[PDB]
Amino acid sequence: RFLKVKNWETEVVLTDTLHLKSTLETGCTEYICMGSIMHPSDVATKDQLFPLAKEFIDQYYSSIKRFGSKAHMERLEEVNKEIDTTSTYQLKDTELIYGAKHAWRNASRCVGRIQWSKLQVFDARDCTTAHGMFNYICNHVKYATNKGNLRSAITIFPQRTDGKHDFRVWNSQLIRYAGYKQPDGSTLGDPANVQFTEICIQQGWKPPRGRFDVLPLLLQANGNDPELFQIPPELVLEVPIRHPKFEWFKDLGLKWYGLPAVSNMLLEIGGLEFSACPFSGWYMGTEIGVRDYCDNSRYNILEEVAKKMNLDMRKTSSLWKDQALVEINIAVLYSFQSDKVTIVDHHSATESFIKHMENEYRCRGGCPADWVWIVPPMSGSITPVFHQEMLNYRLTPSFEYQPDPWNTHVWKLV
Amino acid sequence: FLKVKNWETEVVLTDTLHLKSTLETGCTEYICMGSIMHPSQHARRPEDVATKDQLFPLAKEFIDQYYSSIKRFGSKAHMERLEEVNKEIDTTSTYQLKDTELIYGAKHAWRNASRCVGRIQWSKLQVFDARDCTTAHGMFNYICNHVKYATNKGNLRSAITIFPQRTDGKHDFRVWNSQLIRYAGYKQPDGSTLGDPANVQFTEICIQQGWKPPRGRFDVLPLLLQANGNDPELFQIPPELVLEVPIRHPKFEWFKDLGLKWYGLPAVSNMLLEIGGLEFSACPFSGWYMGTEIGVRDYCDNSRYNILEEVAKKMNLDMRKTSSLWKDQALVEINIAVLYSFQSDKVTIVDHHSATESFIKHMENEYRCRGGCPADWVWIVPPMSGSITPVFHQEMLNYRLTPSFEYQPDPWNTHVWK
Ligand code: HEM
Ligand code: HEM
Ligand SMILES: Cc1cc(N)nc2cc(-c3ccc(CCN)cc3O)c(F)cc12
Ligand SMILES: Cc1cc(N)nc2cc(-c3ccc(CCN)cc3O)c(F)cc12
Ligand SMILES: C[C@H](O)[C@H](O)[C@H]1CNc2nc(N)[nH]c(=O)c2N1
Numbered sequence: 102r103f104l105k106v107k108n109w110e111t112e113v114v115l116t117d118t119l120h121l122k123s124t125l126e127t128g129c130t131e132y133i134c135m136g137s138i139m140h141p142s143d144v145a146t147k148d149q150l151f152p153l154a155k156e157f158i159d160q161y162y163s164s165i166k167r168f169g170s171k172a173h174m175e176r177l178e179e180v181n182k183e184i185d186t187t188s189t190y191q192l193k194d195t196e197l198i199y200g201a202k203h204a205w206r207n208a209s210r211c212v213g214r215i216q217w218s219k220l221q222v223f224d225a226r227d228c229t230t231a232h233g234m235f236n237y238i239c240n241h242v243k244y245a246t247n248k249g250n251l252r253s254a255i256t257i258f259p260q261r262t263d264g265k266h267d268f269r270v271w272n273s274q275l276i277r278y279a280g281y282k283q284p285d286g287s288t289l290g291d292p293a294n295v296q297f298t299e300i301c302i303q304q305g306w307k308p309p310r311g312r313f314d315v316l317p318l319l320l321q322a323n324g325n326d327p328e329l330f331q332i333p334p335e336l337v338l339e340v341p342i343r344h345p346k347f348e349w350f351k352d353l354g355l356k357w358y359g360l361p362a363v364s365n366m367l368l369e370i371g372g373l374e375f376s377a378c379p380f381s382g383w384y385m386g387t388e389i390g391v392r393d394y395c396d397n398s399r400y401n402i403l404e405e406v407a408k409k410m411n412l413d414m415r416k417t418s419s420l421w422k423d424q425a426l427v428e429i430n431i432a433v434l435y436s437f438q439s440d441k442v443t444i445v446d447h448h449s450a451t452e453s454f455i456k457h458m459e460n461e462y463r464c465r466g467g468c469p470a471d472w473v474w475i476v477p478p479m480s481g482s483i484t485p486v487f488h489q490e491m492l493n494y495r496l497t498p499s500f501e502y503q504p505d506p507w508n509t510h511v512w513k514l515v
Numbered sequence: 516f517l518k519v520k521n522w523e524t525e526v527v528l529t530d531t532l533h534l535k536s537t538l539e540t541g542c543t544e545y546i547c548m549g550s551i552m553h554p555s556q557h558a559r560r561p562e563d564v565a566t567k568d569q570l571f572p573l574a575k576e577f578i579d580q581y582y583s584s585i586k587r588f589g590s591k592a593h594m595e596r597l598e599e600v601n602k603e604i605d606t607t608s609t610y611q612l613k614d615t616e617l618i619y620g621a622k623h624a625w626r627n628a629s630r631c632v633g634r635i636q637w638s639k640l641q642v643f644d645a646r647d648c649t650t651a652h653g654m655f656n657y658i659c660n661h662v663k664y665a666t667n668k669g670n671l672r673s674a675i676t677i678f679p680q681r682t683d684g685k686h687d688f689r690v691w692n693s694q695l696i697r698y699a700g701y702k703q704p705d706g707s708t709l710g711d712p713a714n715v716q717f718t719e720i721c722i723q724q725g726w727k728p729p730r731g732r733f734d735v736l737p738l739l740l741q742a743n744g745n746d747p748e749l750f751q752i753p754p755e756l757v758l759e760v761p762i763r764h765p766k767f768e769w770f771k772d773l774g775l776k777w778y779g780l781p782a783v784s785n786m787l788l789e790i791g792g793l794e795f796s797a798c799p800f801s802g803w804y805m806g807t808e809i810g811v812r813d814y815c816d817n818s819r820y821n822i823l824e825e826v827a828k829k830m831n832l833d834m835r836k837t838s839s840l841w842k843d844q845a846l847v848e849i850n851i852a853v854l855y856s857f858q859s860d861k862v863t864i865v866d867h868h869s870a871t872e873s874f875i876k877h878m879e880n881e882y883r884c885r886g887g888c889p890a891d892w893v894w895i896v897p898p899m900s901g902s903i904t905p906v907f908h909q910e911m912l913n914y915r916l917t918p919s920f921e922y923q924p925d926p927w928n929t930h931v932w933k
């Protein structure tokens with residue numbers, strides 16, 4: 102059995118055999134499609150962990166062309182002894198590196214996957230305390246930032262055990278600006294992060310109450326209450342946002358951090374759950390420039406840019422919003438390029454993704470892709486992914502959503 | 516029950532209408548096909564003239580649904596109608612829709628069209644019955660009157676014209692044109708393309724049929740009409756029925772000097788309308804444009820007009836690398852100009868902000884009174900500036916309800932000539 106996908110711009114047709122190897126649900130049914138549902142739908146027993154581990158070990162030994170070998174059979178037997186005696190098992194380092202990389206390779210929502218095989222993996226499964234987690238994250242940040250020459254990296258903390266002893270980064274990203282609601286309903290800083298900012302303040306953080314406050318890290322080790330730590334400022338690389346033509350643009354006082362570093366997702370390898378696994382790459386311009394200033398729930402310098410462009414903001418059909426949105430994204434890209442901080446534009450990114458998709462179909466038999474997320478948030482139909490049919494399915498290892506840790510944490514102090 | 520949520524406003528809607536869905540979407544619990552153009556071939560009936568136990572259960576379902584819609588289920592006229600449909604099938608292997616039934620089903624095929632951001636207008640549809648038509652000449656007369664009515668000197672009105680339903684499959688009525696008004700596309704000797712590059716194949720079929728092409732740049736193609744399965748025939752739409760808007764820009768005086776224009780009336784004519792097992796293979800329908808359809812897809816696809824280049828040139832943009840966003844910037848101006856020209860000439864048009872906001876209101880309406888509204892996020896989100904429109908942050912459920920508009924293969928792949 103085979104499935105085809107067409108590109109209506111180039112007429113190229115690709116044949117997907119890989120979809121046969123997925124066993125995780127997508128959320129759709131035979132009669133309803135849920136492709137635009139954002140999140141669709143305690144810990145693994147012995148009898149559930151055996152076959153999940155078997156599946157992973159099998160695919161790992163297949164990938165290194167050693168399937169059915171004496172080493173393959175010994176590892177399988179060695180894994181079952183652990184599950185049978187301890188109700189869990191420990192990944193080898195080769196297996197951890199392999200699975201982290203393939204979790205990225207399998208991320209159907211990520212346009213950036215042409216880079217998957219160059220992923221620096223930091224094994225932190227020996228960490229025991231939040232001070233330990235802070236050390237590991239600071240080293241991650243320093244390495245990934247590389248003075249502007251950003252490098253992909255993931256840092257993997259101990260796996261879940263019984264669910265009562267989890268490691269979490271409570272931050273959604275390692276570097277984010279605080280947001281403060283004002284008595285008068287206005288907002289200072291980043292409106293996206295208001296909730297987490299209150300959580301920090303309640304935990305004892307002394308907020309500067311400025312426009313671009315780097316939030317503290319809220320780090321949970323082994324199921325204990327989370328603890329606050331200030332990332333050393335000289336580890337946070339930032340780019341002041343200016344425009345190549347509009348000299349007034351710098352006078353908006355804007356800037357953004359250079360390291361996108363997501364920390365709230367859960368890494369699943371062979372049934373093991375790594376509930377704290379911060380990973381980072383580099384930005385596509387529109388994630389700062391379309392959604393991190395111009396979403397209706399964000400900085401809303403859209404109107405200020407349109408005001409400063411003397412645009413007709415009375416009627417929609419003037420397309421001032423569209424027009425000011427373009428200029429902001431031009432400003433973001435020019436800024437990072439000038440300060441030699443790695444960034445990619447949506448055209449260059451989507452073009453690379455198409456090449457990646459083609460290559461993955463050739464050597465792997467398919468490439469799960471989520472069009473709804475792969476298509477950039479602006480200028481969609483003038484980019485080549487727009488006319489590219491795509492198949493979406495869930496392979497493992499994968500990165501999964503998990504609930505916010507304050508919703509489920511049972512506290513310990515006083 | 517299934518919930519949809521809008522992440523800007525946190526409005527949550529609860530969907531039970533999907534329980535009435537009949538056809539497969541192509542998706543499974545293990546694979547999603549939502550960006551496949553045609554993911555499923557699940558149809559309600561087989562390839563040609565069905566047997567009784569194939570046609571009648573679909574007719575009963577539709578007749579049932581129509582009489583329920585008017586609070587008359589099990590009434591005298593409903594039981595009579597069922598028997599009448601049974602005897603017609605028993606004696607002709609098909610049946611004929613009453614005019615109320617035809618009007619209901621056309622409007623509900625639009626209401627069910629999950630890809631259409633325009634459906635807040637769905638029940639204001641003018642239905643022209645053309646089921647008495649027997650030749651291409653008659654089809655041409657019906658189509659002209661359709662074009663004149665819908666254009667309405669620029670105050671556009673929605674309309675569909677419905678020709679005789681398919682009978683055995685050999686006597687189909689077809690409009691070979693994909694839309695009623697399209698521009699020719701000429702393949703050039705030096706390899707390039709003049710005109711409009713989607714319609715190249717169709718432009719050649721017209722010339723091959725004897726059409727003498729003026730070989731200009733905005734050459735309204737002729738109509739190519741097939742009646743009762745016969746060879747199709749050429750007709751030239753009278754120009755005074757083809758309203759066109761010259762494109763200028765409110766700010767750039769040099770824009771109009773690109774010598775650019777577009778027609779006011781989008782009229783899709785290659786789709787199939789299906790009601791209670793019946794298939795109307797010729798059912799051209801028209802509304803009015805969202806601005807992006809002209810000026811994002813019909814000027815700025817790579818395999819279409821591709822005159823982003825010239826607009827960027829005259830704007831003196833740096834086209835050396837893509838990080839300058841010269842494509843994005845010229846694409847905006849083109850769309851600013853399209854809206855300006857149409858509004859300046861009092862020809863109906865809707866910008867993508869207004870249309871998406873209308874669609875969000877329409878979803879709420881539909882969930883309040885109908886228990887749901889099937890929507891294809893991939894097609895509802897406009898092709899530019901998606902995330903600054905309200906539909907971008909709106910979850911959607913896509914399911915297939917009948918009556919519906921369906922795809923059908925281009926008739927030159929299946930037509931045996933004479
Ligand atoms: C190296 C440059 C990278 C680029 C340019 C990139 C780009 C993107 C973009 C634009 C998104 C959509 C986010 C949004 O629209 O809000 C995304 C999602 C995602 N990225 Fe990448 N990415 C990169 C590296 C990585 C790495 C290193 C990983 C992990 C090892 C990763 C894993 C993911 C995942 C799991 C998602 C989707 C999560 C979800 O929402 O379900 N990416 N990426
Ligand atoms: C009145 C103004 C209308 C507007 C602004 C509108 C808008 C749109 C747009 C923008 C699309 C996507 C087209 C594309 O980008 O390729 C679409 C699709 C569609 N429209 Fe509408 N529409 C309108 C009226 C109608 C009417 C009157 C009908 C039928 C009675 C209709 C039936 C459909 C169908 C069936 C599709 C999807 C066809 C497919 O599967 O490709 N629309 N509409
Ligand atoms: C590694 C990485 C790099 C990058 N350059 N960007 C990324 C964006 C997201 C991401 C952030 C937020 C949301 C939900 C809100 N839109 C979904 C995401 O995929 C992510 F996880 C990882 C990213
Ligand atoms: C009634 C109507 C009005 C309008 N203003 N626009 C419409 C666009 C399409 C349409 C056209 C082409 C394609 C494929 C290439 N994009 C899909 C469509 O849905 C359509 F059927 C009907 C439309
Ligand atoms: C509701 C909607 O599906 C949701 O907000 C998604 C849509 N697609 C997206 N696509 C990307 N790349 N990023 C996003 O945040 C979103 N948001």
Ligand SMILES: C[C@H](O)[C@H](O)[C@H]1CNc2nc(N)[nH]c(=O)c2N1
Pocket residue numbers: 109487488489490550551552893894895896897898
């Ligand atoms: C392959 C891709 O899904 C396809 O070309 C679709 C995407 N979404 C679209 N959406 C609209 N409104 N119109 C289109 O032509 C398309 N094209």
Ligand SMILES: [Zn+2]
Pocket residue numbers: 129133134135136542546547548549
């Ligand atoms: Zn689906």
